[PDB]
Structure formats: C-alpha cells, structure tokens
C-alpha cells in the first residue's frame, strides 16, 4: 500500500528524471521525496537479488545506501502498471547548490573547499560501491542548511562502474568531458573528475565555465572572478583535455588547496546559519 504509508505534498520538480513530490512518511512523520518514473522512459534495467526487474536507478541507489549521509538514501520503492515510485529521504531545511550559488554568487574559497570536499567523499563512496553517477552538477547536490552536510541526488543517469569504455551518456552535456563531445567515448573515473572541475569552477566563479561544445573541447579556462592560484591550478588540472592528465580522487584531496577543510557543523555555523 503506497497511498497509505505516505502523505503526499506539493510537486517539488519535474524533468528528465520524472516528477518528484514532497512527502511525509505517516508512521514517524519522516520527510521524504516521492519520485515517479514512467516505465517507457527507463533506458537501463537491472535485476535485484530475487531477479525482479527494476530500473537501474533502483539498483544503483540500493548499492550506495548506508549510514553515510553524503548520498541520497532510497527508503522504499513500488511498481505501478506504467511507472516506478521511489521513496527518497528529504533533508529539511534544504536548498540545492544551484539555487544557493544563484542567490549567493561566487562562494568564498573556504566554503567552496568544504562543499567540494564533501562532494568528493560522496563520489568516492559511489565508486567504492561500484556506482558511477554520471550527472554530477550543482543541481544534483542538496545542502542540509542546519547540518552543513551535502547530499548527491538523482542517480537516474548512472551506471554500474566499470574499467572499460563507455559509449552511451545521458547526463548533463555542459558537465560532460571533451572526449565525450569529440568521440562519444569516455572512461568513468576521468569523466567524473572533469565534471568535478566544472563544479569547482561553478562554486568559486558563480557559474560554469563552458556553455558550448567549442568551449568544452577548446582547452581554455578563463577565470571571471578572483580565484587563488592554488584553486585555479586544481581546476585546470581537473579540466585537462587528455583524460589521463586529470588527477585521481586521491590527488584531488591531497592537493594543497584542499587542506584544512572545515567540518560540516562549522560550515553551517560560519556560512549557513
């Protein structure tokens, strides 16, 4: 019974991911997000343990679910005649990182450092669990404004992580790497690092660097805001044109710009409260 376990609230958003409603779990008043995905729009399917056929997004969410709060938690799911319904946790109060950057403009590097670090830990967790998100962007990052904790959301473009080449992609093009633009080929980790460089530029400059294919492949990073030389170096390294020239996640988190990160609670008290 789906309509009896959850009280449904207003629409939160709709788009390529489906339609997402605010909700509350009746048993304990837990805030949830209720995501509807039409069966005809699901590209990749998977099988659970019991071999029940579910969208791959359900498989990936189950693989990353745990106590670690940096990724969205799938609480339950249901199958309907023409759709699947996913019950996801909902931070409250919350703002996504796209709206946050729109309202605040370019972020102080201390705050960008804290946010970027948490995103790296969340993406490391995905990869540790065998999951490639493929749509890292500010729109897909929720800020818990009380706790200062970030959550990676919308695994609808994701895939099982593999070490061979990917030749399909349905994430966000302005965060996709030049090898995808040029050759329709990418490898998972180095493509994720590219999207992280786009994200870090977005945080410290107030918008993404590239809008057009020619800029993505062009190899020039112009800084529209004052950014420290250390931060610029890390961004330009993540945005190396050759995938093998990009840093690993270890090299990103050992980068000099990344040291002395704020704790999440400190981040909320200094920058969010």
């Amino acid at each position: 019974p789906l309509e009896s376990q959850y009280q449904v609230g207003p629409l939160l958003g709709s788009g390529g991911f489906g339609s997402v409603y605010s909700g509350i779990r009746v048993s304990d008043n837990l805030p949830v997000a209720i995501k509807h995905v039409e069966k005809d729009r699901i590209s990749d399917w998977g099988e659970l343990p019991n071999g029940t056929r579910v969208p791959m997004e359900v498989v990936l969410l189950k693989k990353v679910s745990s106590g670690f709060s940096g990724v969205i938690r799938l609480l339950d799911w249901f199958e309907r005649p023409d759709s699947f319904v996913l019950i996801l946790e909902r931070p409250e109060p919350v703002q996504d990182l796209f709206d946050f950057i729109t309202e605040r403009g370019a972020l102080q590097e201390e705050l960008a450092r804290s946010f970027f670090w948490q995103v790296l830990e969340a993406v490391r967790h995905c990869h540790n669990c065998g999951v490639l998100h493929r749509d890292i962007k500010d729109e897909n990052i929720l800020i818990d404004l009380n706790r200062g904790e970030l959550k990676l959301i919308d695994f609808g473009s994701g895939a099982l992580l593999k070490d061979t080449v990917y030749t399909d992609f349905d994430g966000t093009r302005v965060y996709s790497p030049p090898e995808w633009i040029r050759y329709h080929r990418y490898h998972g980790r180095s493509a994720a690092v590219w999207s992280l460089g786009i994200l870090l530029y977005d945080m410290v400059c107030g918008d993404i660097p590239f809008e057009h294919d020619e800029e993505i492949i062009g190899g020039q990073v112009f800084f529209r805001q004052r950014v420290s030389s250390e931060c610029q170096h890390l961004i330009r390294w993540c945005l190396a044109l050759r995938p093998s020239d990009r840093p690993t996640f270890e090299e990103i988190q050992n980068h000099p710009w990344m040291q002395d990160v704020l704790l999440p609670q400190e981040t909320a008290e200094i920058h969010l409260h």
Partner: peptide, 9 residues
C-alpha cells in the same frame, strides 16, 4: 550574463 539550469540528455 544568464546563468541557467541544464536538463539531462
């Protein structure tokens, strides 16, 4: 200049 969201796909 115009900052905007970008849909997936």
């Amino acid at each position: 200049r115009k900052r905007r969201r970008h849909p997936s796909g």
